[PDB]
Amino acid sequence: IPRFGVKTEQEDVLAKELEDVNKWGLHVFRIAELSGNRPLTVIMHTIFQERDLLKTFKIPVDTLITYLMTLEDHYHADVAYHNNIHAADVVQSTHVLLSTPALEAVFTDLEILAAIFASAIHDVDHPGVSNQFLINTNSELALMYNDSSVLENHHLAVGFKLLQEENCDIFQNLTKKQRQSLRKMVIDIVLATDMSKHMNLLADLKTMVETKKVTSSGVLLLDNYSDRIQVLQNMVHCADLSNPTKPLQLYRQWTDRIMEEFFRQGDRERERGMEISPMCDKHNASVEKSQVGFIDYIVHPLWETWADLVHPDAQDILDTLEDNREWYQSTIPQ
């Protein structure tokens, strides 16, 4: 892209938008257009520089870029929601959640690295259909993974596998112990993004909130791996379920996209003679009521608990969610 050092018309604008990377409600769709459909690459790269991770872990810049481009390529450009823009968004959302005052200096550089990396790979090579669809159609993926966290195991396998491609091992200068530790954390995190685990994960988070302990500066105290990994699992899970907490213009576009992917699964189901899964029937749809339902029973309970953990750091995020819930409610057709 560059031309004799000084920046292009677009590059300048992209660079301007990337100044918002520490903010909730980054214009992630603008960044995707401006970057030539490379939101994951430029946002990861920007975040790594901001956190000084290339120096801390001796990551060569060219290896980082080469890996990010290869990883981004393996998200499907023809899947409406579970694509590279989603991955970029979850990465950036996790990045902001990591900077919350209630967790200052709680996580090591390595844990910070695991959470961002996990976020980047968390839906890679998603085919645009659910675990239950993959199980019900007796797919190769479901067969490989024995019906258990089918997609999530696959996102991990592809994520780690791509590190072994030419000039792609972004972790080449980590010690053996660091590589082990990072690999384990990443697996624990991504496996917890499986939506069938939400209830168990939320219930454990609640327990932690009720028995919450903080240090002599309001900062959250975490004694052991169990508690540390649990917070990172919920953090990334929250980032994954962050669309309803973003400014409405971002939220609506996320909803438009997920409904398209869902409807596309339902058509495929209908062509095979199967029952149409919840949310996937374009002839029996209720988009607004469904978003209200998803917020009340799933997203709000999660983010409310997260907000308690980090109180009051996440109040604005919770207020936007509530406002967006009010708005969708108000639209429900009579």
Ligand SMILES: COc1ccc(C2(c3ccc(OC)cc3)c3cc(O)ccc3-c3ccc(C=O)c(C#Cc4ccc(O)cc4)c32)cc1
């Ligand atoms: C095609 O695959 C799908 C589609 C939808 C869902 C749902 C859902 C409900 C609860 C969940 O637990 C936290 C997760 C998903 C679901 C199940 C159900 O029995 C009734 C309503 C909804 C419902 C309503 C709105 C929504 C979203 O607005 C969802 C969902 C979802 C979803 C799935 C995967 C992702 O990576 C991100 C988001 C779901 C699940 C799988």
Ligand SMILES: [Mg+2]
């Ligand atoms: Mg997923």
Ligand SMILES: [Zn+2]
């Ligand atoms: Zn996701």
